[PDB]
């Protein structure tokens, strides 16, 4: 088969991520969906779209959504870009050659921050699962995983090798000793979430849910447990929403610091922090009226040391920001907003006055976007493309360059079409208005106010183009002719129900209209004849398509399935269930019975109309695919979605016993090696110090598991099971029994792991010598005789030491119970009433017996 | 006397004897103890 693929994607400038700024104002790296694009603020031309080397839609593209980019981060000097995606992976690229250097999957959910540290070679990454991982770049390895937060890492701040400090989407800020990787000090920052973190070395600043911004003093050289990071006071903002990024600078040329808190909505609150001279010369002024009350006033600091500044607003909702500074009169701040647009503002400040009632944007890159989701896409014969938006941004892109060359202002526009000669656009809006535009001249040929009483929903030209059909939610369809280049309403068909799709056949034959009442009706255009009524879809029914032979129609709806109908008798053929949310649009190919359907769950799907298979399952969008349009000839198809994207699609095993034996042999070899080393040390310290042994290096596996040999043998002796322990001890020969006795003799000098394994040592040792008693008492060596005596003394001392406190506790606890009894048990002198009282007050337990 | 279940609700008391507190268990042992309780319910 001649399958499909993706040629190019565009329409996005700023997506659901952050932005990094690079100096030459300068350029900007930001996110498109799953690929990063670089822009020069000066002009705004797309100078780079760094993308994955595999086209989404190819043979090896995997069966899921692609990983949306979610955090840009840049190493300036050594020229790297660490970008991180929504599945958790981190790709590190060199910006010179634009290839992938490092892949750093690691995480389990989407990631929220990156940071290079010690400028090169180290990258720390925080994610929507609460881990935060340190990575080395010279080893390609996750070094450390700091794991104690609970919800989602909202920010952190590190210095090199000793201290990190993170704050997460619970209420908690944490300080991490990066030598031990244990959390040192934990506070509750804000009572809900904690969304911000910034610090200029003395003061730390955090923000939470609503306007309460908290100043902290971190004293890194502190020694107390609670008090490495203390809280110094709160203050307020003007926004009652989530401040979610704070960032600082030190402008030179005096020395000064500025920080911003961007908000959820539309607003960045900028702040100047002042200097120690005006701290000292402002302290007395609030210390006026002359001291317990004045000390309470001086303690209740934030408004003192912090100074608000020019509160920069924007038109849309703010997603990310970053700035640069010179002279303290060029706080030059780039800002990517949600409705895709970047904006380069710059506030001046004459070091006392900010010299403006409201700041000024110096650049704005917004030409290659829409600011809303494209509710309708269209195409020329083959050359141009039509994108229809809610703000009014009709845009005429071109296929061969992916640049909008022509754009207008219409309104809440949901459907549009071209006109068959090209260079002319019809469009209908969500109120009762229709509009006409062109390509060479300006916007409005004419608008028709009161084109319909209510929301228009779908229009269609005839194949010659002179006559178009508009169906609207005022329960009417209308017909319009082109009189000479103006619209002529002549007839109108009022239905009982809100018509929401129209279509004609591609040979002027049928008019199929989709009603809100779960059905479609097929009419004859030449008679308004009411040929057919196709029924049985069971929810209101979206896009129709008529085939090129005018024999076969498709019918999409919100029932998550498309139905194929034969138009000769109105008989159904398939009812194939696609698309688990809602099929928004469905379109045939030009010459074939193959078709495409794009749906509300971020997927387009390629089907055939003969076997009714799914030919292909294309997976490049991220959100609700609102429209798609096929070429008139040739058959390449464009699809446009809710993530502001427009994309083209073209054609192409030991056991117990022997484990204990090998553990015993290496353990006792290490043990008597160290004992020979100690005898060598005593002889070369008691004799002429001219020589000694060189070095016994400790065993590989013993230093690899970090265990003394007694502990190594002790845990493998633990790890054999009780059912095969009497076999594990019976398999081993008498030489291993003798070195087992050496092992027990050494282990009851370390009285820590003697007392934690007393019954195990007793059981194993007594079975060993009880089984090997005949040979043991025939061995003739005073070393083993002294060994047995030493083991006997230390073992029996440990056992009598534990049963001493056992017997003590028995007699003490029964004394306690008995003195409680003789204090207040009861008063019976008569033995029969006494025994009946004790029988009524006894402990009962009921048992299931068999008779 | 035999070690039943805990008389609190932030506590987990196995019949071994080892009482664990839910505020002191990490999330790995929380998932592991939940699956183990699911096994002992399912039998």
């Amino acid at each position: 088969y001649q399958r499909f693929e993706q040629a190019a994607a565009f329409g996005v400038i700023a997506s659901n991520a952050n932005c990094v700024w690079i100096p030459a104002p300068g350029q900007l790296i930001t996110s498109a969906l799953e690929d990063v694009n670089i822009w020069d603020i000066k002009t705004g031309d797309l100078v780079s779209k760094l993308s994955d080397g595999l086209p989404p839609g190819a043979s090896d593209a995997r069966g899921a959504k692609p990983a949306e980019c979610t955090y840009l981060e840049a190493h300036k000097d050594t020229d790297l870009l660490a970008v991180g995606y929504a599945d958790g992976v981190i790709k590190v690229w060199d910006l010179m050659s634009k290839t992938v250097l490092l892949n750093f999957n690691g995480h389990k959910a989407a990631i929220t921050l990156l940071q290079f540290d010690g400028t090169g070679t180290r990258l720390i990454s925080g994610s929507k699962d609460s881990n935060i991982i340190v990575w080395d770049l010279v080893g390609e390895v996750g070094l450390y995983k700091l794991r104690s937060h609970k919800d989602s890492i909202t920010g952190f701040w590190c210095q090199g090798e000793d201290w990190l400090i993170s704050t997460s989407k619970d209420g908690m800020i944490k300080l991490w000793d990066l030598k031990t990787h244990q959390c040192i000090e934990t506070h509750i920052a804000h009572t809900g979430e904690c969304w911000g973190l910034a610090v200029k070395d003395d003061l730390l600043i955090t923000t939470g849910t609503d306007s309460q911004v908290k100043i902290w003093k971190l004293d890194i050289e502190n020694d107390k447990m609670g008090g490495k990071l203390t809280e110094m006071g709160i203050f307020e903002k003007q926004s009652k929403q989530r401040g979610l990024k704070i960032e600082f600078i030190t402008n030179s040329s005096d020395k000064t610091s500025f920080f911003y808190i961007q908000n959820a909505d539309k607003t960045i609150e900028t702040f100047r922090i002042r200097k120690e001279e005006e701290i000292a010369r402002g302290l007395k002024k609030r210390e006026k009226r002359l001291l317990t009350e004045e000390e309470i006033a001086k303690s209740i600091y934030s408004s003192f040391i912090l100074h608000p500044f020019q509160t920069i607003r924007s038109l849309y909702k703010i997603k990310s920001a970053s700035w640069t500074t010179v002279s303290s009169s060029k706080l030059e701040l780039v800002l990517t907003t949600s409705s895709n647009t970047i904006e380069y503002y710059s506030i001046p400040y004459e070091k006392r006055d900010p010299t403006s009632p409201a700041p000024l944007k110096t650049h704005t890159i917004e030409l290659q976007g829409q600011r809303t989701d494209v509710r309708s896409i269209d195409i020329s014969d083959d050359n141009k493309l039509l994108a229809t938006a809610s703000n009014g941004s009709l845009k005429i892109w071109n296929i061969k360059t992916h640049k909008c060359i022509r754009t207008f202002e219409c309104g809440y526009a949901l459907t549009c079409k071209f006109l068959p000669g090209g260079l002319l656009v019809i469009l209908g809006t969500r109120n009762g208005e229709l509009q006409l535009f062109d390509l060479a001249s300006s916007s409005l040929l004419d608008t028709i106010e009161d084109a319909h009483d209510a929301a228009i929903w779908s229009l269609d030209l005839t194949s010659d183009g002179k006559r178009l059909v508009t169906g609207s939610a005022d329960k009417t369809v209308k017909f319009w002719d082109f009189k000479v280049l103006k619209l002529h309403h002549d007839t109108t068909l009022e239905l009982t129900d809100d018509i929401l799709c129209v279509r004609v056949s591609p040979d002027d034959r049928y008019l199929a209209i989709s009603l809100l009442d779960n059905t479609v009706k097929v009419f004859f255009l030449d008679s308004m004849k009411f040929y057919l009524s196709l029924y049985g879809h069971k929810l209101p029914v979206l896009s129709i398509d008529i085939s090129f032979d005018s024999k076969m129609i498709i019918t999409s709806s919100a029932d998550k399935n498309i139905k194929i109908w034969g138009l000769d008798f109105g008989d159904c053929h398939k009812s194939l269930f696609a698309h688990q949310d809602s099929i928004m649009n469905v379109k045939f190919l030009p010459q074939s019975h193959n078709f495409f359907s794009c749906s509300k769950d971020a997927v387009v799907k390629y089907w055939d109309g003969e076997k009714f298979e799914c030919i292909q399952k294309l997976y490049a969008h991220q959100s609700e695919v609102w429209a798609l349009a096929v070429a008139t000839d040739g058959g390449f198809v464009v699809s446009s979605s809710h993530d502001h994207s427009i994309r083209i699609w073209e054609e192409t095993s030991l056991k117990a016993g022997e484990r204990l034996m090998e553990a015993l042999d290496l353990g006792i070899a290490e043990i008597e090696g160290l004992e020979a080393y100690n005898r060598d040390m005593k002889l070369w310290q008691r004799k002429k110090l001219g020589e000694a042994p060189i070095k016994p290096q400790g065993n590989a596996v013993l230093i690899a598991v970090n265990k003394t040999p007694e502990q190594y043998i002790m845990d493998t002796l633990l790890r054999i099971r009780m059912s095969q322990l009497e076999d594990a001890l019976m398999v081993m020969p008498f030489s291993y029994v003798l070195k087992f006795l050496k092992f027990i003799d050494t282990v009851m000098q370390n009285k820590t792991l003697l007392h934690s394994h007393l019954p195990l040592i007793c059981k194993n040792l007594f079975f060993i010598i009880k089984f090997n008693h005949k040979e043991l008492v025939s061995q003739k060596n005073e070393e083993l005789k002294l060994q047995i005596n030493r083991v006997k003394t230390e073992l029996r001392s440990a056992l009598k030491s534990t049963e001493d406190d056992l017997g003590f506790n028995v007699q003490g606890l029964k004394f306690v119970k008995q003195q409680w009894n003789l204090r207040h048990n009861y008063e019976f002198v008569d033995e029969y009433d006494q025994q009946e009282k004790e029988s009524n007050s006894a402990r009962k337990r009921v048992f299931g017996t068999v008779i | 006397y035999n070690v039943g279940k805990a008389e609190k609700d932030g506590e987990i008391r196995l019949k071994n004897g080892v009482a664990m507190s839910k505020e002191e268990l990490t999330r790995e042992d929380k998932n592991r103890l939940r699956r183990a309780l699911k096994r002992k319910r399912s039998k």
Binding site: T180, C183, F766, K770, F808 | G17, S21, E24
Partner: protein, 207 residues
Amino acid sequence: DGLIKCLKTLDGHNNRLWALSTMNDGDMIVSADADGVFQFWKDCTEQEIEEEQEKAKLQVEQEQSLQNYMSKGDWTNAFLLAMTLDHPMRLFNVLKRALGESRSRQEVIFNEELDQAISILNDEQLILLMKRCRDWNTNAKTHTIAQRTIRCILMHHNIAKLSEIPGMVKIVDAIIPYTQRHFTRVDNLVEQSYILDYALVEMDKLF
């Protein structure tokens, strides 16, 4: 009764009720009357969640303190924080670690600072400590830690106090027979520990 919107029913009175006067400052003191008996309901949600969030703040500080003590060593203040937070597995770990290092180094069975810290805890703390010792004593493994803790309680507290604490007989009657079971088992271990002595007398008869 009076009910609020739906959640948070109020205790009300015994019988019928034609009364609601809630209209002080924002919605300040509410008054509600039965046949005769009045009720004066207090305030807005402004401090009963503040004391809850500040005890959450205190608890998350002392939990981190307990983690730092358990890491760096320091078993006495770790013990009293585990007893204050009631973290029983951590309490078993601090007692087991301190007991093992007590066997290592060298009247006193833990270190002196920790068994003084056991000597100065009050009634409900030692009743939860002895409940922990009760259900550790049911093992034959974790029973030595329970016996050392029972022993230091017995030799550092007053026996009349320990008897007259309400609840200290349903615990000590639970753990007398388990200590007797362990006494029988360890005594039989000492009994069968004399095969070493028999093997030594054979090894000396060997010449």
